[PDB]
Design a binder for this molecule. Structure first.
Ligand SMILES: CCC#CCN(c1ccc2nccc(N)c2c1)c1c(Cl)cccc1Cl
Ligand SMILES: CCC#CCN(c1ccc2nccc(N)c2c1)c1c(Cl)cccc1Cl
Ligand SMILES: Nc1ncnc2c1ncn2[C@@H]1O[C@H](CO)[C@@H](O)[C@H]1O
Ligand SMILES: Nc1ncnc2c1ncn2[C@@H]1O[C@H](CO)[C@@H](O)[C@H]1O
Lengths: 322, 320
């Protein structure tokens, strides 16, 4: 009774919200999530926008049970008419819808954000601010096919994995996280994501979010067999950084690493004193949405693309032999 | 016990005290310093060449010496470029303006709790969607030096500052009645003018004033305004009614951009609704989703004063 229901556009189980509606933060709540969900479904199903009496999307009071109920009811009646129309007569989400889905999955999953103990700009709590856009730019730049295996080393609550799995056709996407609190929230993010993606009728690639230490023996062979590694190594100490380079040194030719800090200098010059360095077996480039034909107006951020290339070491040895 | 950033145009340096201020749970002045440096380097290519690249990768925001080293490397690069230019003002890019407006807010609104604003239109979240929707609005209405822009209920003045940085309107006004945002708007104004000079960026003339937009003085001022911006989403029926009476004195082609329409989108003039504001204005819903938008599914409303709607009704009665 004391609740609001939104029918799924594809006939999945309805989204059920209790009344009073949950509040996510000081300026964000479930009332706005309901309005935006309705708007997104109408935007991408044009018959639905035609069927719905749209005056309610102007005339609404988020603090009134009756007003919010009438808004949900108009949308649900329009869903029923469209289901009748389709009776008589499964794609990847757009970037805009995926941004909404990921936020919605986070709001239903991470109920106590204080527990994360994350005060850095890479916190799950601010993922929608810059990270989502930079991951979308990364997806467009780093071409992935069904022959690729994607791994996020230290995946937090799994946001990058969910975004990449919704956008690409990699064979599989993995997220590995060590810390207890984020790996526990990742279990809910996983269930909430699959549920919401089915509610919208959207496709995603296969993915797994797992609890683990990416420096373990099991993960050594797994990194060696990964074609695309994503790693937020910005705050990693020298030991972890060193151990990671040792793991990357076992990757196949053409294997790629995308990171927030470079693992080798951008201007690496192979000599007799730096033959041990990872720079001898990889090309490194700085990718910035500020560079190119990209219409970027966000933060002046960059990421780094590393590609395993053993010809740098091979050519130096030929120079030494001849 | 401080950090200094030299201006790329030789204005007074930006001075930050140490320990560096914290703005929120994930945002501080150390990130502001780094991003300021990155923006100046991005838009001055010789600067990016002169500066040692490692400096913006290996930094510790919690170390005075590390942050001082970072500022020093940028200041030395500014000095080399100033020497290069010795040896022989534009508008900010959208990206730089977004950074400038956040920076102006960070230095001005020290106690955001005081605003008592829990709505999505709060100054505290302006950079999230409002900034992008205002940028879309500026591209859509295409104001010239003959225009006068007025934001009715301007809060801390963010819309006025954005519009004045982007357009060549003769003047931009913000009028705010509430004490706390009107007081913060005075600081936003000073900080904006200072930061714009620091970057060497141009803006149009603007005034942020404390006042009641329903007063007699404002009645004549609204009548002489060519572009009104108003966030009327939470306005009661009395304010809404009084505003329509103000808009009814505007000139033909006068425009009102708002968060809620002042007249129905499907208004049809008849003998029973001749009193309605819909008889003298066109109304259209503008949505960035219609027409590369991936943000929130938001809309705003454009009203254009057009008394020919009323006139055609009378001429249609006399010419059946
Ligand atoms: C951890 C969640 C995330 C993300 C997106 N991202 C970046 C890179 C630099 C940034 N700088 C500042 C602020 C951000 N939010 C940044 C995000 C990223 C990419 Cl695209 C490739 C490889 C690693 C990373 Cl971490
Ligand atoms: C007050 C600060 C602002 C702004 C930009 N804006 C809107 C309009 C609808 C919105 N919907 C949801 C969320 C937002 N942030 C929205 C912002 C706006 C415009 Cl472009 C024209 C006329 C009035 C308005 Cl209020
Ligand atoms: N050895 C590790 N194995 C898996 N995740 C890790 C490990 N070390 C750090 N992390 C995680 O990496 C993330 C930062 O990239 C954080 O969420 C942090 O908990
Ligand atoms: N009569 C008025 N005069 C000036 N500002 C007002 C008036 N009424 C409301 N406001 C302001 O309009 C804004 C609502 O967008 C608030 O900042 C609020 O204080």
């Amino acid at each position: 009774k004391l609740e609001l229901r939104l029918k799924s556009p594809v006939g999945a189980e309805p989204a059920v919200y209790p009344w009073p509606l949950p509040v996510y933060d000081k300026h964000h709540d479930a009332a706005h999530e309901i309005i935006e969900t309705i708007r997104w479904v109408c935007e991408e199903i044009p018959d639905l926008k035609l069927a719905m009496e749209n005056y309610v999307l102007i005339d609404y009071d988020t603090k009134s049970f009756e007003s919010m109920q009438r808004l949900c009811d108009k949308y649900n009646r329009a869903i029923d008419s469209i289901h009748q129309l389709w009776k008589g007569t499964n794609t990847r989400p757009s970037t805009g819808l995926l941004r909404h889905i990921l936020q919605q999955v986070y709001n239903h999953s991470v109920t106590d954000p204080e527990k994360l103990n994350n005060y850095e700009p890479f916190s799950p709590e601010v993922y929608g601010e810059t990270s989502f856009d930079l991951v979308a730019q990364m997806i467009d730049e780093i071409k992935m096919t069904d022959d690729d295996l994607f791994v996020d080393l230290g995946s937090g609550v799994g946001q990058v994995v969910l975004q990449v799995a919704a956008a690409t056709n990699c064979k599989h996407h993995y997220g590995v996280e060590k810390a207890d609190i984020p790996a526990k929230y990742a279990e809910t993010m996983d269930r909430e994501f699959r549920k919401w993606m089915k509610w919208y009728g959207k496709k995603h690639a296969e993915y797994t979010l797992e609890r683990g230490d990416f420096l373990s023996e099991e993960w050594r062979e797994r990194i060696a067999n990964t074609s695309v590694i994503f790693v937020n190594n910005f705050a990693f100490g020298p030991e972890v950084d060193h151990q990671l380079k040792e793991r990357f040194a076992n990757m196949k030719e053409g294997g790629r690493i995308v990171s927030s800090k470079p693992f080798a200098p951008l201007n690496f010059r192979i000599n007799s004193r730096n033959l041990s360095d990872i720079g001898t077996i990889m090309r490194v480039v700085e990718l910035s949405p500020l560079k190119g034909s990209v219409s970027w107006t966000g933060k002046p951020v960059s990421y780094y693309l590393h590609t395993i290339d053993r010809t740098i070491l091979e050519n130096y040895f030929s120079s030494l032999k001849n």
